[PDB]
């Protein structure tokens, strides 16, 4: 009876592909053929934040667009003051293999994790003057790839294994487990309405989940290799992905299909980070060849290059007010552009 | 220029920088090694001996040993999945990679060695190759119950290298088999890289006690070779 279901699954799958085809009538490129081009965009580095012993993997802007936190493989977390380049805190880690970082929206907590299979949470506004560990979430069997804060008590993480999970910090237990992926999940992205979140795994597929229902809602497949990062959209009705086949693609939650692809012949390396501008007109992507291109999200035309790093770019972020974009790399330097 | 509170903020920042420097001295004085290998190998026993001689789903294990006033950190994954395509990029700055092989299903070990050697992010990393469980191989080839030619048809058409230094009490058959396996492993390493990194084969047993000394000597050789190449005299 194994085959009997397979046939149903194949026929059923087609019933979906046809439906998607039908629902498509025009291309986004044709619709935007009339609007004027965005023109050349020039950005120059304004700050250079140094002090990390080894390569850095992740960073996250604060809610006020003033503070930021970065994680490095030497086993340190550093909270920076972006304006004055000062250093606020320096947190040593139990395990030196860290892959992700997250800043709480309230500014009270910070989180990190990696190959140790543990999601640690640190208290910043403690009674005394030293940052201390407040909770250690241990329910995963792979490695932590990403983590995001919903509130001061809810956090969602993605692991090396297929499963994703939602935690309750007070109890330190799992309340919902998301399953359905085939490869390891690498990136994560929350919706602005904090009701849904997308996922990216190493099987060229992205899934849309419902936080309250705890069940997969939609699945998107348009890539050829593993997906590294997914940066959603300001509107929340679309999202972009970066994969290893040197492409970026824009999807939509409503029409449930691909819209446009951002690729160039001269680009061969993979993509490690994706983010959007404040208005959503600009798409910023990091690359393995030490560079960081800027794409017109409505025309798929390059509009600038953020050169200046010596090693590969590993993280990228944009402030809430959209005043600056910070870029990290494997040479242990952080830079801020305008 | 700066307010009273601003000056105190800068003073705290400069005090943090001083702590970072102090930690950098320790970070530069330690060498990190990654220990790979299959389940059938003796990698578990090797780390057990070093630890003795000197937490349920943890994804990595650490052991610290000291040889001649110098320190080493050795990591081995414990709870990751079979996939290794993604988490292998973290170890792109270690001093060396220790590869353990049960030479006593030998093809997939060669495939793993080939994949590790040719990785883009694992270039410029030397490999210390341990051919573990040699007594078992000696007692197995001597019995004659199983012949190596089936799996490897080219073994019959092969001779012991002239530079080989066999043990004075060992049969030449075990020497021929051992050096055939070693040459098969070295063929992959001697086909690419071209001076960026090298391999250091060894003939060891799981119960041996000189493994730490061998690792120390190989690390010293690697660092010395890097220094000589840097100053334009090698």
């Amino acid at each position: 009876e194994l085959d009997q279901l397979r046939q149903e699954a194949e026929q059923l799958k087609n019933q979906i592909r046809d439906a998607r085809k039908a629902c498509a009538d025009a291309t986004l490129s044709q619709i935007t053929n009339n609007i004027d081009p965005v023109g050349r965009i020039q950005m120059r580095t304004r700050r250079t934040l140094r002090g990390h012993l080894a390569k850095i993997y992740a960073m996250h802007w604060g809610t006020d667009s003033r503070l930021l936190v970065s994680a490095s493989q030497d086993g340190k977390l550093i909270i920076w003051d972006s304006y004055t380049t000062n250093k606020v805190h320096a947190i040593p880690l139990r395990s030196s293999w860290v892959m992700t970082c997250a800043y709480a929206p309230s500014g009270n907590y910070v989180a990190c994790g990696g190959l140790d299979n543990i999601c640690s949470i640190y208290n910043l506004k403690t009674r005394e003057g030293n940052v201390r560990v407040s909770r250690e979430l241990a329910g995963h069997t792979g490695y932590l790839s990403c983590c995001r804060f919903l509130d001061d008590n809810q956090i969602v993480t993605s692991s090396g294994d297929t499963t994703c999970a939602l935690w309750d910090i007070e109890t330190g237990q799992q309340t919902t487990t998301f399953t359905g992926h085939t490869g390891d999940v690498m990136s994560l992205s929350l919706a602005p309405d904090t009701r849904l979140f997308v996922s990216g795994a190493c099987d060229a597929s992205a899934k849309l989940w419902d936080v309250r229902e705890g069940m997969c809602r939609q699945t998107f497949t348009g890539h050829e290799s593993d997906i590294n990062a997914i940066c959603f959209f300001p509107n929340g009705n679309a999202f972009a992905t970066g994969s290893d086949d040197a492409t970026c693609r824009l999807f939509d939650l409503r029409a449930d299909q691909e819209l446009m692809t951002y690729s160039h012949d001269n680009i061969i390396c993979g993509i490690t980070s994706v983010s959007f501008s404040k208005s959503g007109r600009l798409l910023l992507a990091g690359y393995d060849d030490f560079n960081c291109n800027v794409w017109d999200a409505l025309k798929a035309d390059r509009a600038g290059v953020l050169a200046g790093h010596d090693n590969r770019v590993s993280c990228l972020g944009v402030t809430d007010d959209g005043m600056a974009v910070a870029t990290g790399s494997w040479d242990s330097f952080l830079k801020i552009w305008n | 220029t700066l307010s009273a509170e601003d000056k105190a903020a800068v003073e705290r920042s400069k005090m943090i920088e001083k702590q970072l420097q102090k930690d950098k001295q320790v970070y530069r004085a330690t060498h990190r090694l990654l220990l790979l290998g299959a389940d059938n190998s003796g990698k578990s026993t090797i780390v057990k001996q070093m630890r003795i001689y000197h937490v349920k789903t943890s994804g990595i294990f650490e052991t610290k040993f000291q040889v001649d006033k110098v320190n080493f950190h050795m990591f081995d994954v414990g709870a990751q999945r079979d996939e290794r395509r993604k988490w292998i990029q973290c170890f792109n700055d270690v001093t060396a990679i220790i590869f353990v092989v049960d030479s006593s299903r030998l093809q997939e070990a060669l495939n793993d060695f080939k994949s590790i050697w040719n990785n883009r992010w694992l270039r410029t990393i030397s490999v210390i190759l341990f051919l573990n469980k040699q007594d078992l191989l000696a007692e197995k080839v001597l019995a004659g119950k199983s012949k190596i030619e089936d799996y490897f048809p080219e073994f019959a058409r092969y001779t012991t290298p002239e530079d080989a230094t066999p043990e004075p009490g060992e049969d030449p058959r075990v020497t021929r088999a051992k050096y055939f396996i070693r040459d098969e492993f070295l063929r992959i390493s001697t086909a690419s890289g071209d001076g960026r990194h090298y391999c250091y084969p060894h003939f060891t047993c799981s119960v041996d006690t000189e493994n730490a000394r061998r690792i120390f000597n190989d690390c010293r050789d690697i660092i010395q070779r890097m220094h000589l190449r840097q100053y334009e005299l090698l």
Partner: single-chain antibody
Amino acid sequence: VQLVESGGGLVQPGGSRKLSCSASGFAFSSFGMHWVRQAPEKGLEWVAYISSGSGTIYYADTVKGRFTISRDDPKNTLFLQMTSLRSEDTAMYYCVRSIYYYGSSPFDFWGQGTTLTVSSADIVMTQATSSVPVTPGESVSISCRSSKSLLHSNGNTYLYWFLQRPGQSPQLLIYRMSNLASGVPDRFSGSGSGTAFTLTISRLEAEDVGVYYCMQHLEYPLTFGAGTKLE
């Protein structure tokens, strides 16, 4: 978090004494420290300051050449040395901790204090009223004045409010004119324009009885003010 001061007593004029304030319950090494004295019936006055790591020491003009302060981090003890005490040095001395970084709240904890009895372009803060009669269950609008614009170019203002109960050490209420300290009720609020400032209480119960002080932190010589008493 607790600080206890040791020493005090009676000393003849032109003598010497050493007061020690020992900390226990927090990371002493990462906190700057202050010494603040209160006259038998007057207001507060800042006398000394030692930074974290002992990299910066400041003194008041009154005791510049007679007092020296130092800290011993491993033993978590701080203590100053007094030489040639005059007859006006009689007061109660408090040790105050403060930490400085973006978004911090300095002057957030005060010690119990010890008593000792002996047998200029400076910003002047003036409290308009020395006593405001009031009942429980209405609003109060204590106000303060400054001789110089406390607003800085970076945006901060550096104005602090303190409340002292009848028989206890002072506690922080508002820092930088707009932020509640740690756990004070939402009734208190602060506002100002850089020269004139005011403090508002929505409702009063029996525990709002005390003296309300002021402070500035723009130029380092710290001036408090006479204070306003609510009874």
